[PDB]
């Protein structure tokens, strides 16, 4: 069985490149080999690249084109569909500078004044039919005609992909192939469109510590990350260094989130990542587009150790928790 050359192999960080069609269409031997490679990637790096996924390259290109049209909207039009609450987790956001006020404590005035917010904007789309949380869609006029149908379409295709990656994890684990289905069939996921504007390289010297997206771990089961060719995504190695996650054409970068890490009793890794300047020298960095589809267990799901991830009960690291409650706590914290 032929393994691909690793997508990343640096400083102890080995991110495998895996042909997903071999899980979806292989004979039983190839299917199991591929599933095990998928799992093993999650257990070690917490990240994998997938190629030959069921989402077609020209549709993905159309989705990026559609997202680029949204972000070209005037500022007033984007704020109209602004992010509201952690409970909804839907709409437009652009991080601003914190302000010094009467309430501010003198100890951190220096820090507030010197802080540099992430140079990015985002628009988040949840599933259409979640009770009490409608998506704030922009008006379908001119270039945004077709925006909703395209993004809903993409949402459902990523939703299907999530279900399939979890099946690969289950197969790799040697548990029931369909174990995760009833934990993820609702599709309580979040489609985050990202635009990192063109920025002069010097902004990064004027604001030291300035990034495009701050270091973090994702919250959910897995995240499907579709990046353009610009570069800048970095993943933390076992040795504590950020390593470039080079774009590879027509791949999806897939990482486990904090909930899956906990769910798996820490047999699966949720790995710190960030977006910085592209590794390339240049006076101006062009606009960078990515799309992060955050996958989650159903909000109603109760999360406790998956079978086969511990031997004795004393090996269980975590109390069971409700999935929905956990996520709102992560989203509301800041
Ligand atoms: O834009 C990227 O490449 C990564 C974004 C990301 O990690 C996130 O939104 O959680
Ligand atoms: O960037 C992290 C995340 C942000 N928003 C979410 O809904 N899930 C995440 O994992
Ligand atoms: Ni992330």
User: CB–CB of 255/223 below 8 Å?
Assistant: yes
The C-alpha atoms of residue 209 and residue 198 are separated, in whole angstroms, by: 18
2 assigned ligand-binding residue: no
Q: Measuring CA to CA, how many Å separate 100 from each of 107, 108, 113?
A: 11, 9, 8
Q: Of the candidates 91, 95, 61, which has an alpha carbon nearest to the alpha carbon of residue 78?
A: 91
The angle formed by the CA atoms of residues 193, 227 and 77, to the nearest 5 degrees, is 25
Give the Å distance between the CA of 271 and the centre of ligand 3: 9
Write down how long the chain is: 334
| β-strands 121-125, 190-196 pairing | antiparallel
Residues lining ligand 2, judged by CB closer than 6 Å?
89, 190, 216, 218-220, 257, 294
Atom of ligand 1 nearest to the CA of 245: 3
218 assigned ligand-binding residue: yes
The angle formed by the CA atoms of residues 47, 51 and 57, to the nearest 5 degrees, is 125
105 assigned ligand-binding residue: no
Pocket probe mutation, ligand 1, options 256, 258, 290, 327, max atoms within 8 Å of Cβ: 290
Domain boundaries, the chain: 1-334
216 assigned ligand-binding residue: yes
Q: Of the candidates 91, 116, 142, 266, which has an alpha carbon nearest to the alpha carbon of residue 199?
A: 116
User: CB–CB of 288/120 below 8 Å?
Assistant: no
Task: Map residue 61 onto helix, strand or coil.
Answer: helix
The closest ligand to the CA of 276 turns out to be: 1
Nearest CA to ligand 1 atom 1: 290
By what method was this entry solved?
A: X-ray
CATH entry 3.40.30.10 includes domain 1-334:
no
Largest CA distance in the chain: 67
The closest ligand to the CA of 259 turns out to be: 2
Task: Map residue 57 onto helix, strand or coil.
Answer: helix
62 assigned ligand-binding residue: no
| Preceding-residue numbers of gaps in the chain (C–N over 2.5 Å) | none
Nearest CA to ligand 1 atom 5: 292
Atom of ligand 2 nearest to the CA of 213: 1
The closest ligand to the CA of 295 turns out to be: 2
Query: What residues contact residue 314 under an 8 Å CB cut-off, 6+ apart?
Result: none
Residues lining ligand 1, judged by CB closer than 6 Å?
192, 194, 213, 218, 225, 227, 233, 273, 275, 290, 292
Give the Å distance between the CA of 168 and the centre of ligand 3: 21
Helix-helix angle 57-71:147-173, to 10 degrees? 130
């Amino acid at each position: 069985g032929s393994m691909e050359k690793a997508a990343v192999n640096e400083d102890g960080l080995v991110i495998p490149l895996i042909d997903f069609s071999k899980f979806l269409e292989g004979d039983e031997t190839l299917k199991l080999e591929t599933a095990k490679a998928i799992l093993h990637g999650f257990q070690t790096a917490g990240f994998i690249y997938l190629k030959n996924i069921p989402i077609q390259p020209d549709f993905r290109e159309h989705v990026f084109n559609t997202s680029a049209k949204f972000f070209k909207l005037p500022k007033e039009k984007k704020l109209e569909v602004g992010w509201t609450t952690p409970e909804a987790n839907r709409g437009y956001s652009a991080p601003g500078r914190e302000k010094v006020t009467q309430l501010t404590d003198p100890a951190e005035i220096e820090k507030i004044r010197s802080a540099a917010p992430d140079i990015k904007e985002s628009y988040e789309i949840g599933r259409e039919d979640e009770p009490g949380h409608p998506n704030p869609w922009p008006a379908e006029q001119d270039d945004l005609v077709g925006f909703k149908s395209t993004m809903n379409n993409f949402f459902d295709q990523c939703k299907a992909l999530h279900i399939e990656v979890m099946r690969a994890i289950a197969v790799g684990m040697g548990i029931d192939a369909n174990y995760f289905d009833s934990f993820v069939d609702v599709g309580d996921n979040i489609l985050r469109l990202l635009h990192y504007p063109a920025v002069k390289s010097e902004v990064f010297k004027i604001n030291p510590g300035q990034v495009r997206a701050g270091e973090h771990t994702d919250y959910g089961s897995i995240t499907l990350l579709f990046q353009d060719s610009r570069g800048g995504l970095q993943v933390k190695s076992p040795n504590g260094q950020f390593i470039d996650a080079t774009p590879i054409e027509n791949t999806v970068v897939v990482n486990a989130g904090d909930l899956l890490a906990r769910w798996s009793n820490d047999t699966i890794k949720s790995t710190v990542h960030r977006v910085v300047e592209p590794p390339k020298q240049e006076d101006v960095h062009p606009p960078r587009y990515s799309i992060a589809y955050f996958c989650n267990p159903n909000h109603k799901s109760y999360i406790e150790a998956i079978p086969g991830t511990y031997a004795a009960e004393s090996e269980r690291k975590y109390e069971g928790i409700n999935s929905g409650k956990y996520l709102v706590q992560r989203l509301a914290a800041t």
